[PDB]
Amino acid sequence: YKEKKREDIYIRYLYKLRDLHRDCENYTEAAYTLLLHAELLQWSDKPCVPHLLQRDSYYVYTQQELKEKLYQEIISYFDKGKMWEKAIKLSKELAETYESKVFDYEGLGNLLKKRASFYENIIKAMRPQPEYFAVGYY
Amino acid sequence: YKEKKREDIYIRYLYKLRDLHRDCENYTEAAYTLLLHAELLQWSDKPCVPHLLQRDSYYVYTQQELKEKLYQEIISYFDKGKMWEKAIKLSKELAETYESKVFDYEGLGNLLKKRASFYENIIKAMRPQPEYFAVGYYGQGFPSFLRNKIFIYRGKEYERREDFSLRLLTQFPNAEKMTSTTPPGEDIKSSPKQYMQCFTVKPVMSLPPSYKDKPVPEQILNYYRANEVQQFRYSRPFRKGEKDPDNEFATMWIERTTYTTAYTFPGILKWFEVK
Amino acid sequence: MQAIKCVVVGDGAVAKTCLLISYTTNAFPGEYIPTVFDNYSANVMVDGKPVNLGLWDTAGQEDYDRLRPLSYPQTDVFLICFSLVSPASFENVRAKWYPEVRHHCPNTPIILVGTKLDLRDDKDTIEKLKEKKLTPITYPQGLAMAKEIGAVKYLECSALTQRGLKTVFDEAIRAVL
């Protein structure tokens, strides 16, 4: 579909795979999928297409709002994904969008609160390194 | 001393004035002083001179460490100084120094925790706008730096004009008031018997950068209405034309006088001569 | 953080509006800019905590005795005013202002205030009143008027001097406080 560029059903299967990975609790993968979704989004105000307006909830959803809501959920997943680096990476830009465009500082406070929790986690604790294997199908 | 560049004793008097302002609880001014101290410091590791190593505590104190400790205390003062904007400004750079150079993320957590408290404070509550007055010192009994000199005083949040006038009169004997508020007195430009005059002035708005057309909330601009200011105007009533009875706009002329001071209120000192 | 209702009435021959504006403007004496609108307000610290307040500037024209009372309800304090140098103002207040104000709001802290106190002792003004057969009526009978109503305070101030003017507002706002 990405080749065929029918972005809407593309988003639909994005969400399908999100459901699957969540069923597997693959928070990393699920959040990456939501990221791929958010990639096409912009920080602009105008909701350019209702195609990105999905079936989960449907009203005005300024492009900015949908992007930030997605980002929020992605951050949640990385947090329970124990990959706080990407969480920090997106937290920064959520913050800067808040600062330069919405000026809602309460969101700043909560966002960076979680950001601190992230830095604490990353320096403090240790996590195992997953092993990698080469699978040769023949 | 700053002229003479003997930085060490300069720091010593910096700390003296810090003690004074703390005694006055002028957290804004005290923290500005510590800022001036921290200005010369760098984020480098090597403690370049033990001159900056003061008498409060003395050991290795890597340049980085002393700078960050100062910054921490300055942030504390701004917080109880109710000026969280500058607190945020320095919190950002403390954080970035942590990230790029020390990698101690616990400091990150605590620092930005306080940062959140700051944002909460600033959007949530409201704080009064301090009034500003123009103090014109005249006469010759005044000291060298006061004779024929005009200052602006960052008074308290709600000082009525004559309350501050009286307060200054306490500061100065031979406490009289010239009544021609606008001009000086040429005789008094040289005469003894120190003469002064006081009046509220208009704090000319700041220019919040990148805000000139943004639909920003009011809190930020109300902050900018009082602080980070140098420009000050005073409306001057005047009659110019015929003084017809039913009308006054045959003669209304306002000879406003702009005032540009060297520094920005608030500062290390709660007043400044008009530059 | 709270606001205080405060009404002021009086004849238009004294220009109490000048007093109010010069106070709120914090104007240098004889330096106020006369605005084009009424009903001034301010945000005031006196004791404990700062408060807002709005000054119900009411025109004294008799015809407006139908819109003045609709403003009266829920008034924290009212300030009755006059001209210390106008016997006609005294006749008005004791005859019209004070009576009808008492009738409309018999239950509100009240303070009486003089005006043109500088002119009260002005030799030219008092001699003009004498040759025009008006009396530079003095403080003690103002106190008699106060005790007649038992107004919680009586005061005398001036515009070109602002003397006690700040005080005037201080006891005005401490009438509630």
Side-chain angles (χ1 to χ4, degrees):
Chain A
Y1 278 8
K2 180 179 70 176
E3 162 68 29
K4 309 329 278 171
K5 304 158 296 306
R6 192 58 71 90
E7 56 178 359
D8 187 62
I9 48 183
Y10 179 86
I11 305 147
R12 213 173 39 82
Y13 292 118
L14 291 194
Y15 276 77
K16 301 286 190 68
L17 183 62
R18 185 264 298 163
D19 312 315
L20 274 179
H21 268 313
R22 175 200 33 209
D23 296 330
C24 300
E25 296 82 30
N26 300 356
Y27 299 158
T28 305
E29 298 66 359
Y32 286 164
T33 53
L34 280 72
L35 181 62
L36 262 64
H37 178 199
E39 289 275 0
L40 62 84
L41 281 74
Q42 288 77 15
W43 295 112
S44 304
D45 50 333
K46 56 181 75 65
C48 300
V49 293
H51 295 88
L52 60 84
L53 273 300
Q54 79 292 351
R55 290 83 170 273
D56 311 338
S57 196
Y58 182 76
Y59 41 101
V60 290
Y61 287 167
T62 181
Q63 179 80 226
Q64 175 52 50
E65 184 280 334
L66 184 63
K67 197 159 174 75
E68 58 82 20
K69 171 54 62 67
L70 264 66
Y71 266 98
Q72 177 276 335
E73 191 56 350
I74 308 194
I75 297 290
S76 297
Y77 284 174
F78 290 161
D79 181 71
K80 41 195 170 290
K82 273 69 60 183
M83 293 180 183
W84 304 273
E85 295 74 350
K86 288 302 298 298
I88 299 300
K89 265 176 43 53
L90 317 170
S91 171
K92 309 268 172 152
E93 66 184 1
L94 184 56
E96 66 182 1
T97 57
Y98 281 165
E99 294 293 328
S100 64
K101 285 171 287 192
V102 72
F103 312 100
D104 180 75
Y105 291 178
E106 175 53 20
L108 278 297
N110 312 120
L111 167 61
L112 61 83
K113 185 74 54 63
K114 294 328 284 166
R115 194 186 305 210
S117 58
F118 301 165
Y119 292 105
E120 189 283 333
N121 279 356
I122 192 66
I123 57 167
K124 183 264 305 176
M126 281 316 119
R127 62 191 181 278
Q129 296 279 268
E131 297 90 359
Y132 292 164
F133 318 97
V135 184
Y137 289 135
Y138 292 95
Chain B
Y1 278 8
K2 180 179 70 176
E3 162 68 29
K4 309 330 278 171
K5 304 158 296 306
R6 192 58 71 90
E7 56 178 359
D8 187 62
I9 48 183
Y10 179 86
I11 305 147
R12 213 173 39 82
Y13 292 118
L14 291 194
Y15 276 77
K16 301 286 190 68
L17 182 62
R18 185 264 298 163
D19 312 315
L20 274 179
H21 268 313
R22 175 200 33 209
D23 296 330
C24 300
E25 296 82 30
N26 300 356
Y27 299 158
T28 305
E29 298 66 359
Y32 286 164
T33 53
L34 280 72
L35 181 62
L36 262 64
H37 178 199
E39 289 275 0
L40 62 84
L41 281 74
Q42 288 77 15
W43 295 112
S44 304
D45 50 333
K46 56 181 75 65
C48 300
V49 293
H51 295 88
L52 60 84
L53 273 300
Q54 79 292 351
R55 290 83 170 273
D56 311 338
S57 196
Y58 182 76
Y59 41 101
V60 290
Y61 287 167
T62 181
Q63 179 80 226
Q64 175 52 50
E65 184 280 334
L66 184 63
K67 197 159 174 75
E68 58 82 20
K69 171 54 62 67
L70 264 66
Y71 266 98
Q72 177 276 335
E73 191 56 350
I74 308 194
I75 297 290
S76 297
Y77 283 174
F78 290 161
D79 181 71
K80 41 194 170 290
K82 273 69 60 183
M83 293 180 183
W84 304 273
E85 295 74 350
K86 288 302 298 298
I88 299 300
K89 264 176 43 53
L90 317 170
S91 172
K92 309 268 172 152
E93 66 184 1
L94 184 56
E96 66 182 1
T97 57
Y98 281 165
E99 294 293 328
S100 64
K101 285 171 287 192
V102 72
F103 312 100
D104 180 75
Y105 291 178
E106 175 53 20
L108 278 297
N110 312 120
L111 167 61
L112 61 83
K113 185 74 54 63
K114 294 328 284 165
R115 194 186 305 210
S117 58
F118 301 165
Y119 293 105
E120 189 283 333
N121 279 356
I122 192 66
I123 57 167
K124 182 264 305 176
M126 281 316 120
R127 62 191 181 278
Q129 296 279 268
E131 297 90 359
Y132 292 164
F133 318 97
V135 184
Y137 289 135
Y138 292 95
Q140 198 51 253
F142 274 137
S144 82
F145 62 101
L146 292 189
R147 49 204 57 187
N148 300 354
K149 294 319 288 159
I150 297 151
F151 280 55
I152 297 90
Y153 276 64
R154 185 155 176 286
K156 195 62 61 66
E157 73 270 359
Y158 188 34
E159 287 177 356
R160 313 298 308 204
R161 182 176 67 85
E162 292 75 356
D163 303 337
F164 166 88
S165 177
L166 177 62
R167 276 204 317 119
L168 188 150
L169 304 190
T170 310
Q171 188 63 20
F172 277 86
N174 59 87
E176 57 264 4
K177 304 103 175 177
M178 321 165 277
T179 183
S180 200
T181 175
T182 306
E186 177 47 51
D187 47 348
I188 306 301
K189 297 315 286 298
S190 80
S191 161
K193 184 68 175 177
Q194 305 169 356
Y195 278 177
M196 61 79 71
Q197 42 183 357
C198 174
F199 52 92
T200 302
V201 290
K202 308 304 302 150
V204 163
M205 295 298 102
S206 171
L207 289 196
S210 70
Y211 288 17
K212 272 76 72 166
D213 62 358
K214 278 74 176 175
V216 292
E218 57 84 15
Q219 296 77 331
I220 307 300
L221 60 84
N222 79 33
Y223 178 71
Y224 276 66
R225 291 201 300 268
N227 318 328
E228 294 89 3
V229 298
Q230 301 169 356
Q231 306 282 329
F232 298 93
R233 63 174 77 266
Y234 174 59
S235 304
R236 184 64 177 86
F238 180 56
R239 293 317 186 98
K240 173 175 173 183
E242 72 289 357
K243 270 65 57 185
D244 59 356
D246 192 26
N247 296 318
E248 62 279 54
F249 319 103
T251 56
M252 300 285 218
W253 282 76
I254 308 305
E255 291 73 1
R256 281 191 314 179
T257 67
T258 188
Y259 297 132
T260 64
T261 183
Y263 295 159
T264 55
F265 279 169
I268 52 178
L269 181 64
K270 318 156 72 53
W271 49 99
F272 280 126
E273 54 85 19
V274 56
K275 183 53 70 169
Chain C
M1 172 86 238
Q2 65 101 30
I4 295 289
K5 267 198 200 167
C6 174
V7 186
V8 161
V9 311
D11 57 323
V14 192
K16 276 77 78 175
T17 67
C18 297
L19 279 296
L20 268 66
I21 190 165
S22 304
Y23 163 78
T24 47
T25 304
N26 289 316
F28 199 74
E31 297 296 326
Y32 71 108
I33 298 298
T35 70
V36 301
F37 298 136
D38 294 332
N39 221 339
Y40 306 136
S41 164
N43 189 297
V44 176
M45 185 66 204
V46 63
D47 285 308
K49 70 169 288 294
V51 311
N52 282 311
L53 54 84
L55 302 197
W56 309 83
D57 177 17
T58 52
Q61 280 70 13
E62 65 287 354
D63 50 358
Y64 293 97
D65 203 2
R66 80 291 184 275
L67 271 297
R68 64 185 83 252
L70 305 173
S71 296
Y72 297 175
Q74 282 82 22
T75 303
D76 294 331
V77 291
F78 167 68
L79 277 296
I80 192 66
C81 319
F82 64 87
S83 166
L84 288 154
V85 75
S86 171
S89 74
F90 306 142
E91 294 294 328
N92 186 3
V93 62
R94 287 101 161 102
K96 149 73 172 65
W97 276 130
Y98 161 79
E100 61 87 14
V101 174
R102 281 301 309 171
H103 295 105
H104 290 96
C105 288
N107 45 5
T108 298
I110 176 61
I111 297 97
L112 174 73
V113 293
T115 311
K116 285 183 264 284
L117 188 46
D118 54 332
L119 296 201
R120 162 173 164 179
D121 294 331
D122 186 297
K123 62 100 174 181
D124 179 71
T125 311
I126 64 178
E127 75 184 1
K128 264 54 183 171
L129 264 71
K130 293 290 104 178
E131 76 200 0
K132 88 181 77 172
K133 290 85 200 173
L134 290 178
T135 318
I137 293 298
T138 64
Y139 173 79
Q141 51 281 49
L143 188 138
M145 181 45 227
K147 301 291 189 292
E148 176 275 348
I149 183 58
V152 74
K153 192 57 187 76
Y154 165 60
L155 302 167
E156 303 199 17
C157 65
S158 162
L160 215 48
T161 67
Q162 315 162 351
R163 293 174 94 271
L165 181 147
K166 294 201 287 185
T167 300
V168 158
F169 295 97
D170 300 344
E171 289 83 4
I173 62 171
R174 88 184 64 258
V176 160
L177 303 180

